[PDB]
PDB file of C-alpha atoms and ligand atoms in Angstrom:
ATOM      1  CA  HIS P   1      69.239 106.500 109.117  1.00  0.00           C
ATOM      2  CA  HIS P   2      71.726 108.331 109.258  1.00  0.00           C
ATOM      3  CA  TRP P   3      74.952 108.266 106.452  1.00  0.00           C
ATOM      4  CA  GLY P   4      76.519 105.409 105.223  1.00  0.00           C
ATOM      5  CA  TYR P   5      78.474 103.701 102.527  1.00  0.00           C
ATOM      6  CA  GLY P   6      75.759 101.278 101.476  1.00  0.00           C
ATOM      7  CA  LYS P   7      73.243 101.558  98.211  1.00  0.00           C
ATOM      8  CA  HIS P   8      70.983 103.590 100.840  1.00  0.00           C
ATOM      9  CA  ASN P   9      72.141 105.675 102.064  1.00  0.00           C
ATOM     10  CA  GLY P  10      75.824 106.194 100.094  1.00  0.00           C
ATOM     11  CA  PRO P  11      77.664 108.216  98.823  1.00  0.00           C
ATOM     12  CA  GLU P  12      75.079 109.916  95.554  1.00  0.00           C
ATOM     13  CA  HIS P  13      72.368 110.378  98.838  1.00  0.00           C
ATOM     14  CA  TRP P  14      74.716 112.664 101.035  1.00  0.00           C
ATOM     15  CA  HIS P  15      73.531 115.532  98.978  1.00  0.00           C
ATOM     16  CA  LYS P  16      70.281 115.807 101.003  1.00  0.00           C
ATOM     17  CA  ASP P  17      71.623 116.629 104.040  1.00  0.00           C
ATOM     18  CA  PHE P  18      75.138 118.276 103.116  1.00  0.00           C
ATOM     19  CA  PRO P  19      74.563 119.502 100.559  1.00  0.00           C
ATOM     20  CA  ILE P  20      77.559 120.818 100.452  1.00  0.00           C
ATOM     21  CA  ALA P  21      78.061 118.019  98.102  1.00  0.00           C
ATOM     22  CA  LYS P  22      77.841 119.624  95.485  1.00  0.00           C
ATOM     23  CA  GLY P  23      80.252 122.295  96.139  1.00  0.00           C
ATOM     24  CA  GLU P  24      82.825 123.640  94.085  1.00  0.00           C
ATOM     25  CA  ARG P  25      86.040 122.469  96.479  1.00  0.00           C
ATOM     26  CA  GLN P  26      84.922 118.943  97.088  1.00  0.00           C
ATOM     27  CA  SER P  27      86.853 115.594  98.050  1.00  0.00           C
ATOM     28  CA  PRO P  28      88.291 113.126  96.510  1.00  0.00           C
ATOM     29  CA  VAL P  29      89.519 114.178  93.024  1.00  0.00           C
ATOM     30  CA  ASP P  30      91.062 112.026  90.272  1.00  0.00           C
ATOM     31  CA  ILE P  31      94.529 113.148  89.606  1.00  0.00           C
ATOM     32  CA  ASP P  32      95.455 113.719  86.049  1.00  0.00           C
ATOM     33  CA  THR P  33      98.777 113.730  86.354  1.00  0.00           C
ATOM     34  CA  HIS P  34      99.558 115.095  83.001  1.00  0.00           C
ATOM     35  CA  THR P  35      97.482 118.126  84.064  1.00  0.00           C
ATOM     36  CA  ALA P  36      99.341 118.436  87.455  1.00  0.00           C
ATOM     37  CA  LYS P  37     101.207 121.500  87.072  1.00  0.00           C
ATOM     38  CA  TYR P  38     105.152 120.445  88.622  1.00  0.00           C
ATOM     39  CA  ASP P  39     105.635 124.239  91.126  1.00  0.00           C
ATOM     40  CA  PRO P  40     108.707 125.814  92.093  1.00  0.00           C
ATOM     41  CA  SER P  41     107.213 127.332  95.381  1.00  0.00           C
ATOM     42  CA  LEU P  42     106.292 124.859  97.010  1.00  0.00           C
ATOM     43  CA  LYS P  43     108.745 123.873 100.090  1.00  0.00           C
ATOM     44  CA  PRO P  44     109.261 119.640 101.585  1.00  0.00           C
ATOM     45  CA  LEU P  45     107.298 118.386 103.521  1.00  0.00           C
ATOM     46  CA  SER P  46     107.865 118.270 107.022  1.00  0.00           C
ATOM     47  CA  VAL P  47     106.767 115.246 108.985  1.00  0.00           C
ATOM     48  CA  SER P  48     107.780 116.166 112.890  1.00  0.00           C
ATOM     49  CA  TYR P  49     106.668 112.888 114.233  1.00  0.00           C
ATOM     50  CA  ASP P  50     108.874 112.312 116.622  1.00  0.00           C
ATOM     51  CA  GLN P  51     106.658 112.992 119.445  1.00  0.00           C
ATOM     52  CA  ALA P  52     103.449 111.303 119.060  1.00  0.00           C
ATOM     53  CA  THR P  53     101.298 110.478 121.487  1.00  0.00           C
ATOM     54  CA  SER P  54      98.986 107.500 120.610  1.00  0.00           C
ATOM     55  CA  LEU P  55      96.122 107.356 122.539  1.00  0.00           C
ATOM     56  CA  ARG P  56      93.249 104.574 121.400  1.00  0.00           C
ATOM     57  CA  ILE P  57      91.962 102.756 118.754  1.00  0.00           C
ATOM     58  CA  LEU P  58      87.775 103.804 118.055  1.00  0.00           C
ATOM     59  CA  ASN P  59      85.746 101.439 115.466  1.00  0.00           C
ATOM     60  CA  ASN P  60      83.083 104.812 114.390  1.00  0.00           C
ATOM     61  CA  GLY P  61      81.100 102.780 112.560  1.00  0.00           C
ATOM     62  CA  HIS P  62      82.445 103.842 109.271  1.00  0.00           C
ATOM     63  CA  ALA P  63      86.405 103.515 109.844  1.00  0.00           C
ATOM     64  CA  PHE P  64      88.099 103.483 112.312  1.00  0.00           C
ATOM     65  CA  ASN P  65      90.780 105.984 113.767  1.00  0.00           C
ATOM     66  CA  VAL P  66      93.766 105.625 115.344  1.00  0.00           C
ATOM     67  CA  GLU P  67      93.500 108.973 117.442  1.00  0.00           C
ATOM     68  CA  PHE P  68      96.477 111.371 119.143  1.00  0.00           C
ATOM     69  CA  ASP P  69      97.298 113.335 122.116  1.00  0.00           C
ATOM     70  CA  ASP P  70      97.045 116.749 120.376  1.00  0.00           C
ATOM     71  CA  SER P  71      96.522 119.559 123.392  1.00  0.00           C
ATOM     72  CA  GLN P  72     100.559 120.019 122.686  1.00  0.00           C
ATOM     73  CA  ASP P  73     102.626 120.277 119.149  1.00  0.00           C
ATOM     74  CA  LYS P  74     103.814 116.509 120.085  1.00  0.00           C
ATOM     75  CA  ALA P  75     103.288 115.570 116.116  1.00  0.00           C
ATOM     76  CA  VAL P  76     103.231 118.458 113.988  1.00  0.00           C
ATOM     77  CA  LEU P  77     103.018 118.214 109.959  1.00  0.00           C
ATOM     78  CA  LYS P  78     104.644 121.737 108.219  1.00  0.00           C
ATOM     79  CA  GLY P  79     105.885 123.505 105.015  1.00  0.00           C
ATOM     80  CA  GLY P  80     104.430 121.974 101.584  1.00  0.00           C
ATOM     81  CA  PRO P  81     102.117 123.745 100.877  1.00  0.00           C
ATOM     82  CA  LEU P  82     101.566 124.892 104.633  1.00  0.00           C
ATOM     83  CA  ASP P  83     101.001 127.712 106.716  1.00  0.00           C
ATOM     84  CA  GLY P  84     101.814 127.149 109.583  1.00  0.00           C
ATOM     85  CA  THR P  85     102.087 123.969 111.633  1.00  0.00           C
ATOM     86  CA  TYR P  86      99.261 121.345 111.256  1.00  0.00           C
ATOM     87  CA  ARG P  87      98.634 118.631 114.433  1.00  0.00           C
ATOM     88  CA  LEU P  88      97.731 115.262 114.449  1.00  0.00           C
ATOM     89  CA  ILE P  89      95.212 114.330 115.554  1.00  0.00           C
ATOM     90  CA  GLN P  90      94.327 111.171 113.815  1.00  0.00           C
ATOM     91  CA  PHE P  91      94.426 108.663 111.583  1.00  0.00           C
ATOM     92  CA  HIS P  92      92.308 106.021 109.631  1.00  0.00           C
ATOM     93  CA  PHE P  93      92.090 104.217 105.970  1.00  0.00           C
ATOM     94  CA  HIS P  94      89.424 103.716 103.602  1.00  0.00           C
ATOM     95  CA  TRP P  95      89.292 100.182 101.618  1.00  0.00           C
ATOM     96  CA  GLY P  96      87.265  98.063  99.065  1.00  0.00           C
ATOM     97  CA  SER P  97      85.933  94.815  99.154  1.00  0.00           C
ATOM     98  CA  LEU P  98      88.192  94.205  96.562  1.00  0.00           C
ATOM     99  CA  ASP P  99      92.253  94.947  95.767  1.00  0.00           C
ATOM    100  CA  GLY P 100      90.885  96.656  92.335  1.00  0.00           C
ATOM    101  CA  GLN P 101      89.274  99.646  94.445  1.00  0.00           C
ATOM    102  CA  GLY P 102      89.467 101.067  97.577  1.00  0.00           C
ATOM    103  CA  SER P 103      91.102 104.333  97.419  1.00  0.00           C
ATOM    104  CA  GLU P 104      89.410 108.048  97.759  1.00  0.00           C
ATOM    105  CA  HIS P 105      91.749 109.698  95.306  1.00  0.00           C
ATOM    106  CA  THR P 106      92.524 108.372  92.215  1.00  0.00           C
ATOM    107  CA  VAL P 107      96.040 108.603  89.890  1.00  0.00           C
ATOM    108  CA  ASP P 108      95.235 108.459  86.522  1.00  0.00           C
ATOM    109  CA  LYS P 109      92.059 107.195  87.108  1.00  0.00           C
ATOM    110  CA  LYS P 110      93.976 104.267  89.155  1.00  0.00           C
ATOM    111  CA  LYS P 111      92.270 102.694  92.012  1.00  0.00           C
ATOM    112  CA  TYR P 112      94.858 101.507  95.278  1.00  0.00           C
ATOM    113  CA  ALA P 113      93.411  98.671  97.149  1.00  0.00           C
ATOM    114  CA  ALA P 114      93.094 101.402 100.413  1.00  0.00           C
ATOM    115  CA  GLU P 115      94.320 105.040 101.181  1.00  0.00           C
ATOM    116  CA  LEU P 116      95.967 106.433 104.394  1.00  0.00           C
ATOM    117  CA  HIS P 117      94.366 109.561 105.993  1.00  0.00           C
ATOM    118  CA  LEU P 118      96.562 111.500 108.367  1.00  0.00           C
ATOM    119  CA  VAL P 119      94.688 114.238 109.799  1.00  0.00           C
ATOM    120  CA  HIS P 120      95.550 117.603 111.259  1.00  0.00           C
ATOM    121  CA  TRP P 121      94.930 120.740 112.397  1.00  0.00           C
ATOM    122  CA  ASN P 122      95.915 124.577 112.085  1.00  0.00           C
ATOM    123  CA  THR P 123      96.830 125.137 115.331  1.00  0.00           C
ATOM    124  CA  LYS P 124      96.082 129.232 114.697  1.00  0.00           C
ATOM    125  CA  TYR P 125      91.949 128.209 115.634  1.00  0.00           C
ATOM    126  CA  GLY P 126      93.140 126.415 118.302  1.00  0.00           C
ATOM    127  CA  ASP P 127      90.843 123.795 118.253  1.00  0.00           C
ATOM    128  CA  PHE P 128      90.134 121.235 115.925  1.00  0.00           C
ATOM    129  CA  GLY P 129      86.471 121.821 116.292  1.00  0.00           C
ATOM    130  CA  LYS P 130      86.691 125.346 114.949  1.00  0.00           C
ATOM    131  CA  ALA P 131      89.408 124.417 112.549  1.00  0.00           C
ATOM    132  CA  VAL P 132      86.936 122.635 110.377  1.00  0.00           C
ATOM    133  CA  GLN P 133      84.987 125.228 109.961  1.00  0.00           C
ATOM    134  CA  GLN P 134      88.254 126.885 108.158  1.00  0.00           C
ATOM    135  CA  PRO P 135      89.043 127.115 104.869  1.00  0.00           C
ATOM    136  CA  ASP P 136      92.737 126.425 106.031  1.00  0.00           C
ATOM    137  CA  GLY P 137      92.221 124.882 109.157  1.00  0.00           C
ATOM    138  CA  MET P 138      92.904 121.098 107.780  1.00  0.00           C
ATOM    139  CA  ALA P 139      95.157 119.291 106.034  1.00  0.00           C
ATOM    140  CA  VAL P 140      95.062 115.309 105.519  1.00  0.00           C
ATOM    141  CA  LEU P 141      98.427 113.464 104.247  1.00  0.00           C
ATOM    142  CA  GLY P 142      96.878 110.930 102.115  1.00  0.00           C
ATOM    143  CA  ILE P 143      98.549 107.753 101.130  1.00  0.00           C
ATOM    144  CA  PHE P 144      97.778 105.113  98.355  1.00  0.00           C
ATOM    145  CA  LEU P 145      98.344 101.074  99.928  1.00  0.00           C
ATOM    146  CA  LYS P 146      98.930  98.876  97.255  1.00  0.00           C
ATOM    147  CA  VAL P 147      98.445  95.390  97.719  1.00  0.00           C
ATOM    148  CA  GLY P 148     102.337  93.382  98.088  1.00  0.00           C
ATOM    149  CA  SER P 149     104.593  92.668 101.127  1.00  0.00           C
ATOM    150  CA  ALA P 150     103.327  93.503 104.523  1.00  0.00           C
ATOM    151  CA  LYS P 151     104.403  96.922 105.812  1.00  0.00           C
ATOM    152  CA  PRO P 152     105.719  96.182 109.749  1.00  0.00           C
ATOM    153  CA  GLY P 153     104.572  99.109 110.929  1.00  0.00           C
ATOM    154  CA  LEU P 154     100.781  98.878 109.912  1.00  0.00           C
ATOM    155  CA  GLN P 155     101.153  94.851 111.693  1.00  0.00           C
ATOM    156  CA  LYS P 156     100.041  96.615 115.013  1.00  0.00           C
ATOM    157  CA  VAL P 157      97.536  98.301 113.794  1.00  0.00           C
ATOM    158  CA  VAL P 158      96.434  94.902 112.290  1.00  0.00           C
ATOM    159  CA  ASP P 159      97.046  92.914 115.544  1.00  0.00           C
ATOM    160  CA  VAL P 160      94.593  94.818 117.749  1.00  0.00           C
ATOM    161  CA  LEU P 161      91.690  95.320 115.251  1.00  0.00           C
ATOM    162  CA  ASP P 162      89.681  92.045 117.122  1.00  0.00           C
ATOM    163  CA  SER P 163      89.344  94.045 119.933  1.00  0.00           C
ATOM    164  CA  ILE P 164      87.067  96.697 117.558  1.00  0.00           C
ATOM    165  CA  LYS P 165      85.544  94.672 115.567  1.00  0.00           C
ATOM    166  CA  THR P 166      82.455  96.496 116.402  1.00  0.00           C
ATOM    167  CA  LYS P 167      80.698 100.347 115.405  1.00  0.00           C
ATOM    168  CA  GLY P 168      81.561 101.903 119.168  1.00  0.00           C
ATOM    169  CA  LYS P 169      84.383  99.533 119.836  1.00  0.00           C
ATOM    170  CA  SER P 170      87.623 100.882 121.202  1.00  0.00           C
ATOM    171  CA  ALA P 171      90.890  99.795 122.587  1.00  0.00           C
ATOM    172  CA  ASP P 172      93.883 101.347 124.169  1.00  0.00           C
ATOM    173  CA  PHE P 173      96.183 101.918 121.592  1.00  0.00           C
ATOM    174  CA  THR P 174      99.792 104.100 123.303  1.00  0.00           C
ATOM    175  CA  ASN P 175     103.534 104.024 122.223  1.00  0.00           C
ATOM    176  CA  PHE P 176     102.575 103.713 118.056  1.00  0.00           C
ATOM    177  CA  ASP P 177     105.066 105.312 116.257  1.00  0.00           C
ATOM    178  CA  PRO P 178     102.308 106.656 112.903  1.00  0.00           C
ATOM    179  CA  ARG P 179     106.312 107.413 111.310  1.00  0.00           C
ATOM    180  CA  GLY P 180     106.217 103.604 110.140  1.00  0.00           C
ATOM    181  CA  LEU P 181     103.584 104.346 107.635  1.00  0.00           C
ATOM    182  CA  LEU P 182     104.826 106.508 105.161  1.00  0.00           C
ATOM    183  CA  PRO P 183     106.875 105.595 102.196  1.00  0.00           C
ATOM    184  CA  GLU P 184     110.378 106.388 101.485  1.00  0.00           C
ATOM    185  CA  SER P 185     109.381 109.406  99.061  1.00  0.00           C
ATOM    186  CA  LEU P 186     107.643 112.337 100.223  1.00  0.00           C
ATOM    187  CA  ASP P 187     106.942 114.481  96.660  1.00  0.00           C
ATOM    188  CA  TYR P 188     102.851 115.219  96.738  1.00  0.00           C
ATOM    189  CA  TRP P 189     100.453 116.321  94.746  1.00  0.00           C
ATOM    190  CA  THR P 190      97.922 118.674  97.196  1.00  0.00           C
ATOM    191  CA  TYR P 191      94.845 120.670  95.916  1.00  0.00           C
ATOM    192  CA  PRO P 192      92.095 122.798  97.986  1.00  0.00           C
ATOM    193  CA  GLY P 193      89.722 120.185  98.764  1.00  0.00           C
ATOM    194  CA  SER P 194      86.758 119.105 101.599  1.00  0.00           C
ATOM    195  CA  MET P 195      86.469 115.879 103.996  1.00  0.00           C
ATOM    196  CA  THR P 196      85.974 112.788 102.040  1.00  0.00           C
ATOM    197  CA  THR P 197      82.637 112.279 104.565  1.00  0.00           C
ATOM    198  CA  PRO P 198      80.154 113.650 106.623  1.00  0.00           C
ATOM    199  CA  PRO P 199      79.903 116.849 107.231  1.00  0.00           C
ATOM    200  CA  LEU P 200      81.905 117.409 103.769  1.00  0.00           C
ATOM    201  CA  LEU P 201      83.607 120.811 105.476  1.00  0.00           C
ATOM    202  CA  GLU P 202      85.746 122.213 102.711  1.00  0.00           C
ATOM    203  CA  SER P 203      88.811 123.044 104.508  1.00  0.00           C
ATOM    204  CA  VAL P 204      91.371 120.270 103.589  1.00  0.00           C
ATOM    205  CA  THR P 205      94.893 121.243 101.902  1.00  0.00           C
ATOM    206  CA  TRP P 206      95.367 118.021 100.578  1.00  0.00           C
ATOM    207  CA  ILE P 207      98.637 116.874 100.440  1.00  0.00           C
ATOM    208  CA  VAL P 208      98.389 113.093  98.291  1.00  0.00           C
ATOM    209  CA  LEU P 209     101.814 110.931  98.103  1.00  0.00           C
ATOM    210  CA  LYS P 210     102.496 109.657  95.004  1.00  0.00           C
ATOM    211  CA  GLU P 211     104.672 107.533  97.003  1.00  0.00           C
ATOM    212  CA  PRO P 212     102.462 103.869  97.515  1.00  0.00           C
ATOM    213  CA  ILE P 213     102.573 102.120 100.014  1.00  0.00           C
ATOM    214  CA  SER P 214     102.931  98.118 100.228  1.00  0.00           C
ATOM    215  CA  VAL P 215     100.751  96.018 102.528  1.00  0.00           C
ATOM    216  CA  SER P 216     100.056  93.046 102.587  1.00  0.00           C
ATOM    217  CA  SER P 217      97.229  90.636 101.211  1.00  0.00           C
ATOM    218  CA  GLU P 218      97.118  88.983 104.933  1.00  0.00           C
ATOM    219  CA  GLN P 219      96.947  92.951 106.174  1.00  0.00           C
ATOM    220  CA  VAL P 220      94.348  94.247 103.926  1.00  0.00           C
ATOM    221  CA  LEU P 221      92.253  90.893 104.845  1.00  0.00           C
ATOM    222  CA  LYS P 222      92.139  91.892 108.218  1.00  0.00           C
ATOM    223  CA  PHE P 223      90.449  95.474 107.639  1.00  0.00           C
ATOM    224  CA  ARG P 224      87.930  93.470 105.681  1.00  0.00           C
ATOM    225  CA  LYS P 225      86.571  91.942 108.602  1.00  0.00           C
ATOM    226  CA  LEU P 226      85.256  94.395 111.153  1.00  0.00           C
ATOM    227  CA  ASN P 227      81.948  95.626 111.380  1.00  0.00           C
ATOM    228  CA  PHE P 228      80.157  98.545 110.068  1.00  0.00           C
ATOM    229  CA  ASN P 229      77.177  97.233 112.833  1.00  0.00           C
ATOM    230  CA  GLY P 230      76.856  97.939 116.658  1.00  0.00           C
ATOM    231  CA  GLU P 231      77.518  94.350 118.681  1.00  0.00           C
ATOM    232  CA  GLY P 232      74.604  91.985 118.903  1.00  0.00           C
ATOM    233  CA  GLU P 233      73.186  93.179 115.905  1.00  0.00           C
ATOM    234  CA  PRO P 234      73.411  91.834 111.645  1.00  0.00           C
ATOM    235  CA  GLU P 235      76.747  92.050 110.648  1.00  0.00           C
ATOM    236  CA  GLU P 236      78.008  94.222 108.073  1.00  0.00           C
ATOM    237  CA  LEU P 237      81.374  94.059 106.654  1.00  0.00           C
ATOM    238  CA  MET P 238      83.411  96.906 106.506  1.00  0.00           C
ATOM    239  CA  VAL P 239      84.181  96.520 103.045  1.00  0.00           C
ATOM    240  CA  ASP P 240      84.060  99.304 100.326  1.00  0.00           C
ATOM    241  CA  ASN P 241      83.735 102.685 102.739  1.00  0.00           C
ATOM    242  CA  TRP P 242      85.400 105.066 100.346  1.00  0.00           C
ATOM    243  CA  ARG P 243      83.997 108.473  98.422  1.00  0.00           C
ATOM    244  CA  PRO P 244      84.426 107.865  94.583  1.00  0.00           C
ATOM    245  CA  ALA P 245      85.702 110.507  92.893  1.00  0.00           C
ATOM    246  CA  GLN P 246      84.667 114.090  92.532  1.00  0.00           C
ATOM    247  CA  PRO P 247      84.699 117.099  90.329  1.00  0.00           C
ATOM    248  CA  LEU P 248      87.622 119.057  89.847  1.00  0.00           C
ATOM    249  CA  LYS P 249      86.123 122.261  89.129  1.00  0.00           C
ATOM    250  CA  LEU P 250      88.607 123.786  87.730  1.00  0.00           C
ATOM    251  CA  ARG P 251      90.895 123.899  90.336  1.00  0.00           C
ATOM    252  CA  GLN P 252      94.663 123.019  90.087  1.00  0.00           C
ATOM    253  CA  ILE P 253      96.663 120.323  91.528  1.00  0.00           C
ATOM    254  CA  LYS P 254     100.219 121.066  91.964  1.00  0.00           C
ATOM    255  CA  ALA P 255     103.155 118.774  92.399  1.00  0.00           C
ATOM    256  CA  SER P 256     105.961 118.898  94.622  1.00  0.00           C
ATOM    257  CA  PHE P 257     108.203 116.958  92.148  1.00  0.00           C
ATOM    258  CA  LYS P 258     108.455 116.462  87.757  1.00  0.00           C
TER     259      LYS P 258
HETATM  260 ZN1  LIG O 301      89.755 109.497 105.481  1.00  0.00          ZN
END
């Protein structure tokens, strides 16, 4: 069968259909905070999400994606390590069966309960499908989630998950503000990597924020109630949909902060 997160179709198997799995710039990675170097020539990140136009939420059998209208520069990321303008197309998360695992990136081997990815494409390539084939085609803003107090900006997401329980279900999801998912600080690490799901393309500039957001136990519990399977198929809970840390292979991780 096709790719997943189980014993039989999970990350150890991906390289047979996607040989770039064993490539030179795979993600995620462990961020060693002692080895990352402060890079004085990194600009502050510019997250311009005021005109973000959310459309839909979809269970794609791997995660759920909240999709945005990316036909114009309505919600963009720029600055930081980036040249040019990257448009927000979707966000999703990765999460664990337990609070001690679920992030894809780790920080000195520490795993967080979950990780949010805000996926952007480089507008100089005109569309997302062309952008994913270029080495500077994508920029993913990664945010760690720890369990603590509730994140009020996440609750609208939590509330709709009932309606997209199984693979292929979608719901209308307009007027959601992705600014409510950000922590206070935009301090970050950055390195060149890849998509963390098949087809594992090596087209991502990763920007991983130093400050986690806190979500509540009840919020993450709702994520764990989703299903990987389709309606009418045997229930497999959507948990542990993360890829483990890949070798760094002499890439340098840079910090925006001292
Ligand atoms: Zn992701």
